[PDB]
Design an enzyme around this catalytic site. Sequence first.
Site, PDB file in Angstrom:
ATOM      1  N   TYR A 127       0.887  -1.233   0.007  1.00  0.00           N
ATOM      2  CA  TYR A 127       0.069  -0.018  -0.051  1.00  0.00           C
ATOM      3  C   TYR A 127       0.874   1.250   0.216  1.00  0.00           C
ATOM      4  CZ  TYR A 127      -3.488  -3.464   1.823  1.00  0.00           C
ATOM      5  OH  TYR A 127      -4.614  -4.428   1.790  1.00  0.00           O
ATOM      6  N   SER A 135       5.245   2.449   0.765  1.00  0.00           N
ATOM      7  CA  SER A 135       6.757   2.297   1.533  1.00  0.00           C
ATOM      8  C   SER A 135       7.043   3.676   2.301  1.00  0.00           C
ATOM      9  CB  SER A 135       7.698   1.756   0.253  1.00  0.00           C
ATOM     10  OG  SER A 135       8.243   2.765  -0.442  1.00  0.00           O
ATOM     11  N   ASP A 148      -2.548   1.622  11.375  1.00  0.00           N
ATOM     12  CA  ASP A 148      -3.676   1.928  10.548  1.00  0.00           C
ATOM     13  C   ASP A 148      -4.878   1.080  10.748  1.00  0.00           C
ATOM     14  OD1 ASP A 148      -1.540   3.966  10.602  1.00  0.00           O
ATOM     15  OD2 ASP A 148      -1.508   4.111   8.561  1.00  0.00           O
TER      16      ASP A 148
HETATM   17  C1  LIG Z   1       0.698   9.047   8.986  1.00  0.00           C
HETATM   18  O1  LIG Z   1       1.679   8.312   8.291  1.00  0.00           O
HETATM   19  C2  LIG Z   1       2.149   6.960   8.479  1.00  0.00           C
HETATM   20  C3  LIG Z   1       3.532   6.862   8.279  1.00  0.00           C
HETATM   21  C4  LIG Z   1       4.237   5.875   8.337  1.00  0.00           C
HETATM   22  C5  LIG Z   1       3.509   4.750   9.090  1.00  0.00           C
HETATM   23  N1  LIG Z   1       4.439   3.694   9.350  1.00  0.00           N
HETATM   24  C6  LIG Z   1       4.232   2.725   8.904  1.00  0.00           C
HETATM   25  O2  LIG Z   1       3.313   2.451   7.864  1.00  0.00           O
HETATM   26  N2  LIG Z   1       5.003   1.666   9.177  1.00  0.00           N
HETATM   27  C7  LIG Z   1       4.584   0.265   8.531  1.00  0.00           C
HETATM   28  C8  LIG Z   1       4.755   0.189   7.018  1.00  0.00           C
HETATM   29  C9  LIG Z   1       3.899  -0.234   5.975  1.00  0.00           C
HETATM   30  C10 LIG Z   1       4.158  -0.176   4.791  1.00  0.00           C
HETATM   31  C11 LIG Z   1       5.434  -0.258   4.334  1.00  0.00           C
HETATM   32  C12 LIG Z   1       6.694  -0.313   5.350  1.00  0.00           C
HETATM   33  C13 LIG Z   1       6.254   0.014   6.696  1.00  0.00           C
HETATM   34 CL1  LIG Z   1       7.502   0.226   7.688  1.00  0.00          CL
HETATM   35  C14 LIG Z   1       5.329   4.047  10.507  1.00  0.00           C
HETATM   36  C15 LIG Z   1       5.074   5.103  11.312  1.00  0.00           C
HETATM   37  C16 LIG Z   1       5.734   5.396  12.589  1.00  0.00           C
HETATM   38  N3  LIG Z   1       6.981   4.320  12.924  1.00  0.00           N
HETATM   39  C17 LIG Z   1       7.160   3.189  11.850  1.00  0.00           C
HETATM   40  N4  LIG Z   1       8.178   2.506  12.266  1.00  0.00           N
HETATM   41  C18 LIG Z   1       8.290   1.238  11.448  1.00  0.00           C
HETATM   42  C19 LIG Z   1       9.965   1.182  11.357  1.00  0.00           C
HETATM   43  C20 LIG Z   1       7.605   0.066  12.237  1.00  0.00           C
HETATM   44  C21 LIG Z   1       6.036   0.144  12.372  1.00  0.00           C
HETATM   45  C22 LIG Z   1       7.749  -1.244  11.327  1.00  0.00           C
HETATM   46  O3  LIG Z   1       8.117  -0.245  13.282  1.00  0.00           O
HETATM   47  N5  LIG Z   1       6.362   2.997  10.804  1.00  0.00           N
HETATM   48  C23 LIG Z   1       2.323   4.878   9.477  1.00  0.00           C
HETATM   49  C24 LIG Z   1       1.676   5.841   9.020  1.00  0.00           C
END
Ligand SMILES: COc1ccc(N(C(=O)NCc2ccccc2Cl)c2ccnc(N[C@@H](C)C(C)(C)O)n2)cc1
Length: 336
Positions: free
Chosen positions: A31, A33, A163
Amino acid sequence: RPTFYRQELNKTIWEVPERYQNLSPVGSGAYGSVCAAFDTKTGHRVAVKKLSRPFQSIIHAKRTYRELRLLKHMKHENVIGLLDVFTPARSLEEFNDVYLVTHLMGADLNNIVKCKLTDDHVQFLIYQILRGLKYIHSADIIHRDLKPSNLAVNEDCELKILDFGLVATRWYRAPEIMLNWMHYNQTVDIWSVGCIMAELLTGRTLFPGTDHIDQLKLILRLVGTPGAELLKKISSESARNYIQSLAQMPKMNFANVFIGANPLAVDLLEKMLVLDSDKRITAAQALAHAYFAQYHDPDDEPVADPYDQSFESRDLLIDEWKSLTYDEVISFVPPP
Ligand SMILES: COc1ccc(N(C(=O)NCc2ccccc2Cl)c2ccnc(N[C@@H](C)C(C)(C)O)n2)cc1
């Protein structure tokens, strides 16, 4: 408007405001990166997510809009929130890419091979899940797919739900989204929380099924076959055929399945792992349970403003969802 710059982050290219420097990609998914990033304006590390193909179709276009509307509405410390949303495009015409920004979290719960967890820790983690779930449920939003990887933690153990949106997933799913219903309430999420909590306390997935049949079997071996009260409430005929055709299984003692656990956690798990949705404990109730004595404070477990999901029943053209999304970007008001 600010100024942007362009780099290529390993296939994906990226155009962001110079406010964000130091983009180091953190992984990938279908969805979008994400890059980890340094935000010049606040000092804080932040996470930036470029959507894959946000407007490629009506379903992608409607999902982009859902995610953004969902993110603009959430303002709670246990639920991930919107620091910024931006596009490179100066007009609707040229509008094709969306990026979302929130605080960077350091880990997800799915890594708890070691830090298995202690009871102190289970309490604080589940407490904060329940706290965020209360707020989410209060605006009639259901997560639907809560699992270890959807739950992010910092090193101080501050937790955020990622989410509420849109085999790993399988293991935490309420058994009532499995056998087919299309009315299942908020408490589908309390089941997942029960499943997550089992796992942190124990170090293993309570229900590691290989498919929607096996998963079901795993579940009924602990909570038992439904009784005439729950059979009473099953509208679906094939569901009723399947379940009544099974060898009866007894409701187990949870005290003996989670042997040596805080018995207080055991009681909670029993109120969460109820087959019948109408009887499962809610988020609000669950936070007043004695397991959370140390953390519970009703002057600071808030609900959310009214949220308007009427869009959800709407059938629009790809460019209508796209313009609606743009309106949501244009009107974004940041936080302090
Ligand atoms: C409001 O807009 C955001 C911005 C980013 C994220 N976010 C995230 O989606 N990570 C999951 C993921 C989904 C798809 C592809 C790569 C990844 Cl790492 C985040 C947000 C905060 N922290 C993380 N940390 C990463 C390293 C995790 C969840 C893998 O620990 N990811 C959520 C919403």
